[PDB]
Symmetry: D2
Subunit: 474 residues, 4 copies
Amino acid sequence: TSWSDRLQNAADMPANMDKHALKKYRREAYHRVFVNRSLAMEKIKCFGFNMDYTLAVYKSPEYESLGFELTVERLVSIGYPQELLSFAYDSTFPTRGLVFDTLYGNLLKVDAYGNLLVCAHGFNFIRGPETREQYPNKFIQRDDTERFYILNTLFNLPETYLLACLVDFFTNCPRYTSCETGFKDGDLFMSYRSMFQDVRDAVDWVHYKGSLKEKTVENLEKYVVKDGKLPLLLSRMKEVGKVFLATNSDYKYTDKIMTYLFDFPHGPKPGSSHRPWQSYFDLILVDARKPLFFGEGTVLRQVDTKTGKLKIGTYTGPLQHGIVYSGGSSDTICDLLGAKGKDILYIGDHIFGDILKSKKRQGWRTFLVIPEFAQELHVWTDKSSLFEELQSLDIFLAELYKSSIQRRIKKVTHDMDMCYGMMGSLFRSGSRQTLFASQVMRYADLYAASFINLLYYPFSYLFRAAHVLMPHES
Amino acid sequence: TSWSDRLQNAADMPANMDKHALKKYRREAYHRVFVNRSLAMEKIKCFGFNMDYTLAVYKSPEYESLGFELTVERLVSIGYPQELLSFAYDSTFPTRGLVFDTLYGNLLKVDAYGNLLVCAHGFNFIRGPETREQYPNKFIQRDDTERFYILNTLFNLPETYLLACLVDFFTNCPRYTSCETGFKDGDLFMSYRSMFQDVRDAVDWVHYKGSLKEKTVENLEKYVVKDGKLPLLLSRMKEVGKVFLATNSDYKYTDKIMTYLFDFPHGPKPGSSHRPWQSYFDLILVDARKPLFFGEGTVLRQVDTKTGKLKIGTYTGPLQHGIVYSGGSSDTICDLLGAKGKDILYIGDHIFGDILKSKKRQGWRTFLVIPEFAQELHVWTDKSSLFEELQSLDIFLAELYKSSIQRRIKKVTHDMDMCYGMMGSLFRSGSRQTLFASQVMRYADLYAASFINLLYYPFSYLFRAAHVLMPHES
Amino acid sequence: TSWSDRLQNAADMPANMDKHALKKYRREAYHRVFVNRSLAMEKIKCFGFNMDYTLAVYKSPEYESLGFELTVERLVSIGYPQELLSFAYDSTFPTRGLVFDTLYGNLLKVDAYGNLLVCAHGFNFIRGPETREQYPNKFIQRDDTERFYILNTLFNLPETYLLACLVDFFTNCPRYTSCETGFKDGDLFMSYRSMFQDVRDAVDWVHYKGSLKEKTVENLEKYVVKDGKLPLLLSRMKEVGKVFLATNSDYKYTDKIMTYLFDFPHGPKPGSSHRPWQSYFDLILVDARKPLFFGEGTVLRQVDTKTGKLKIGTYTGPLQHGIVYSGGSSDTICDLLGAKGKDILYIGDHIFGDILKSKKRQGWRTFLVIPEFAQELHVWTDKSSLFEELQSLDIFLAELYKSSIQRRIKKVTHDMDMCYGMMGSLFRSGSRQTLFASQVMRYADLYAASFINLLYYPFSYLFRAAHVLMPHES
Amino acid sequence: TSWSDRLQNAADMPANMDKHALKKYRREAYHRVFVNRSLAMEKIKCFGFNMDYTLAVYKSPEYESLGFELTVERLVSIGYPQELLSFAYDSTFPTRGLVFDTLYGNLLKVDAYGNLLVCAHGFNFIRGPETREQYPNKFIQRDDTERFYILNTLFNLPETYLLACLVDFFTNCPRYTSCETGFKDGDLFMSYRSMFQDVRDAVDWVHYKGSLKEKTVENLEKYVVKDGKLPLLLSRMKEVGKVFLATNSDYKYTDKIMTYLFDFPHGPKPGSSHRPWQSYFDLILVDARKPLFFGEGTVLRQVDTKTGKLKIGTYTGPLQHGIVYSGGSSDTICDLLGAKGKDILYIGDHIFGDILKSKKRQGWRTFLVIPEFAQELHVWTDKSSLFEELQSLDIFLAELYKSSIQRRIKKVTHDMDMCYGMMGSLFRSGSRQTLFASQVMRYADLYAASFINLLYYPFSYLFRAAHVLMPHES
């Protein structure tokens, strides 16, 4: 049972729009919308979406394996050794949000301050004392974007496992000698940095040049979660305001995906005429080039929706029914929709290019979609006694200042983490929070395992957060 | 009664080193050390300081007025109009941490997300509806460092008032016409940006070229808080670890200031031989060039302590008794003191160049000195019933979703803010926190009105913070 | 009769290696090597080549038309209008070395100081008075590389004609309105800059992604000049020193092209065993990435000559027989060949990425191959009486300072230029020299219509230039 | 007899404005204007000047020594050793235009291609074979502006000698050890780069902060050449067009200098009322910030000619009688004077910031003032038999290809060079031209030892250059 299974199970249930069942449905955790900063729903005039992993949620682990397999074949096709074809994607290993260190070839899990929580070389997990030889402060400067790459996305999931697979292979293949910053193969030296780049490159290639999008569109039921509730919600959003799409993907892909997502013998409610996905949107924009989209942007173009190709030149006309946009900026959306930032709830999955940047750069309200969260919640409520026991040992160890406690703490931590996978929870490693966690609280006003949980709150709802107080203020 | 008075009153009391009186002294707020992230004092091996507004706390408002007067004379000396000499520094107006907008010439108080809390043009406070003509989202991109300058420091206090003084003068002088981005004087157009730069420049000039440092050193009792408790604390720090200084200031100034700060007929305790300020330090470093200091740094030089001038060339020798350093980097301190980041508690007052950067870039533990805080605390504990009434009206207005409340909220907010000054608290405007507040919590592990509050905790103390939990985790 | 015909006619003649016939052959202009700076051939220890338009000279106009046709189809394939398919490459229009002005959409011919010689909008040649509305000083800042693109190469020939074709089409198509900086198509505005970029992009695409290289290799006799004299010369070069190749092209293409160029039933002389093209080289280097090659370079890789693919990682071994290199730098060639700059005569065709940069950045001796020059010479010696008449009218107009002369000067100039084409000589427009001319003199020590003219000088030859004197020095 | 003596001797003679004596005066070399590119004087509508070393020519070696002495005292004042005070400026050593190599601490004389002509370490002249250990190709990349500083100006003359003085001192002082890239002083290491920077800095300091300008203005007869012919020429320039000034210097200095230069009991001709220097100018501009002046420039300000200080803000009014400008750009001059580039003859002395940049960036016509040239000419016409003998030995050595010649060539070269000084001619080292020479020909249309030689040509004069031909074109 993966996280995408949990979502598709909730996707298969019709929507019960009784005002009481709604209140009762969103009492269970898996249908709640969690609040990091207070949000008056009546002040939202525009609802924004990205597509990939928001409207279209890719079924795990089928889609990650397909991304892995395609990437492995691309590397082999440029001269990586054949053994890579013996690799197989293992969803139990990678947790989203790790930091790969191109200098020493380590996958690292870190907190909001760049403190090392977990270090693994290949599939070898390094313990506290042994990491200090390369990380003498148990600390990394995340700002050093030349050395450290953060695997923020679910697209990064297959490369996350791959980078481990690769380090482990070369470490243990006798044709290579291991060195501190890479592998020596007689007279070729492959640094972890160039090995990293090759992977990064081959992932890019399978999305933009290879067959990933092709093989996806030929089996959408296998790879894409469908939910008849999705047209319902969007329809209701259009009743109280405006709805727009701003995806990085291209209109041909966006047309294929969006058509499938709306492929039902009915419209928003069962029994209504079916409507084309574009009619649920007031403004459609593709090739968004996020995060550059929230700054200067790119040139605003117009799609020829028959040919799928862009019209030549810069588009200077107004927002029309039917028109589809390419490029532009976040200001394009504000100007054409007559909106201000805090009028806009922008629903997305990218913690950086969607959520952080629209908040910092524009003042947009944010809703963060976390696919895995559907499985993350399950593990949490089942294992809450372990975390409660952990909270207990911390408090007791704090009283002790008036030694076997510290070793029991590291043990219940280890056991709790493993329930989430080899790399542990998305949001923490024991009692210590992650960089990812920290970002979700700081930048995502609302968050959930799917934005469909918004169907279950009335449109007048005041999401409430607790006010933050400084130490001296309590 | 200013904040510097509160400190100098606590500075004049001898230290009562009984283990009970200590516990009892640090129960009152004004002597507590507040904790944002847990800190084991036994893990600190090195204590770091800056000087200005940390070891040497400049008496308010005497020092701000001297900085103001000198700056006003410098502007007049390059052809600003004479009326500036009629200005007089008013400590009730400026609050540290404001953002000056060089485009529209407004002083702005903003929160962690760049939300406008207070906007003032000159001395004219703009209300909510009227700000939206220049700030259509009530929002500024703080990242636009070409348009927005944040007045982080107490050195920025006199220019903060000056920029208002200036806008107000030109607005109301009939020789000028007001325009949106500056003032037109017949055929000269002075933009708020160039007016800003001139000020910024004249502040720099009085510190580095003018007579500010001179006039300070000729009346140190008037301008610098002295506390016989300061040698005590440093001595105790040297008993359990190493102590270092890293100031941006120059050795001649640092020698004058530091000598005064240690000018007592005794050493650390009354009755002990007096020691020279340098002997309380394991490593002294001047011309630190923070924040560049925590990155690549500058070249490490050696001071000729007799002449006050630097020796020629790059210093390549080891840490010696007596030697004084110039430039270098934070790695210089680690290497010479044999320390790792989390071994170091670095005590400073600059929220950016001291605290934020040593944490993000190095993994240093941080203690933030907030001078004004001594007065900020006083206003808070006296007016806690106003804030409690505010907290009450927010909760009640939240229940109301089952209109005169919203106008009473803005009224008790206004009254509370004014008690702090015309620009309100350092840390908030009503129930909404500031950018500054947000940074103190995020980057300063410990904070206080003076680092001398550390004298009152034993050296084994485990400062404790509450663990942070995500919404779904409670 | 094009220039490539003149070369292929000389290529078809066997080499007569009698010491007298050599001296007599290189007396005619078409077989001379012209000298801009003195060059002792005995001091050359290494001979360097690029490939495209040096070893492999592409037959005109067949190859330019194929590049044009392919480029036109690529633009149509991204939504340019169909009429482009009615275009046909016209070799009489473009002269290499023009400057396209992306602001006003003009092809421009300019001198060493950026003085306008010829301005054409589409196919409309603007006369002196009319250009001053956009060029008020008859001058362009060639340094403004954002506005001006110099069409240096023979690869740029088809886009040179295309950019004219395009401007002329849109100017005169009624579906568009002409404006100063581009064309308005209802609500799309196509600037000359974006139209330029699209072309630049589609040229890049046909070389690197399209079928140009494919269609070339399937008809090498149609598209590539072959000369049995080429192995002879290279063999003799290897007898007195070392010979190397450094091409931007890829090893698969370089293998196909180079094999054809050496495809003869004999080796260097008729009757000798045939040798494989690689054996004529001491060091082979592909993917050179010139001009970046003469600075920091790229990473040195090693080609797997069986698969055509690069080996993975950085190559750290020595120069071996058989090895082929990828990337690297000019220092790679010096180090492996044990050479200094002035030991190296580097033979190439790119006035910038080959010749200028190897001279300025490294101190290499340079030989510039100018394909067109074979036709340029023919026009010059036939029309020398026109140029002599021009020289005469200038001198006479200079004496006149003690008006129909100035109009006769512009008339004989016009007539002379046209003999070279619609855009005139590569090297001049009348008595005024071009930017290109100026660069050849300043940066190319030797130059010729083909480097094969070097076969006709003994290996001890001291090429001689006249010493340059300053005015006051004569 | 220095070069400034030759000028001041010509400055002391009244102007004989008979049309015959003029023709006869400019037949001698020392009063000719030499032509690098043809120039119709009737097409000049605006005459431009800088001031320092053009209108005001500083008397040698008095002014260089004063610059040296002041600079030496400034270095001593920041802790350089006392022995520097034993240095004394020696005008026989430095030639303008050398390249100092901050890596190996060598003064170098180089040609247009960065070929080493002369290398001196301190005062030790390195011969051909010995330079190849640091310069293996006898070649430097002049583009590497981090390593190489070109001493273009006469202001650079005293530092040129100083850098030698310094290297020689430290090399031979026993308190220091010499190393490849600097000097080790126990535990301080002074690199030639930092030693260079210190000098560069101390030269800047004496001009802008020290007493150089002060001590100049208190003895203008000692330090500044005065010529009553200067008002004459400018007056005649104003009769046929417009005259402007654009100096980097400040208005207070420019007022002091310019007043002295016009201090005569008469105006342009003897017997005319004296006029104030400003009235000879249509547009005066100070703080020009060349070469940035010929690009984007700085903000246009207006000087308060009574106070010497700038008015506050940006000046937006028109060109008025009496107004003085500060900053701006070259476009400011064109717009206010209604001129195009080729309308403007700009007379200056800086080969880069004046001449090269106004030509490349704007299309200005250029006149280059070369102070030293008055002495350079004298040495040349006296020693023409040595150069003729040199030209002879080169030709003979070229015939010899059908060994004591090559050693006689290096000997007559050495003897010829020394007549110019220890570093030889400005324009050559033997038969090989310098980088400086090359630039004068390429960028200065006209040049002379003083622009006063323009008085001797009528205003209709067509300066003539020989047309340049490519090898194949003769």
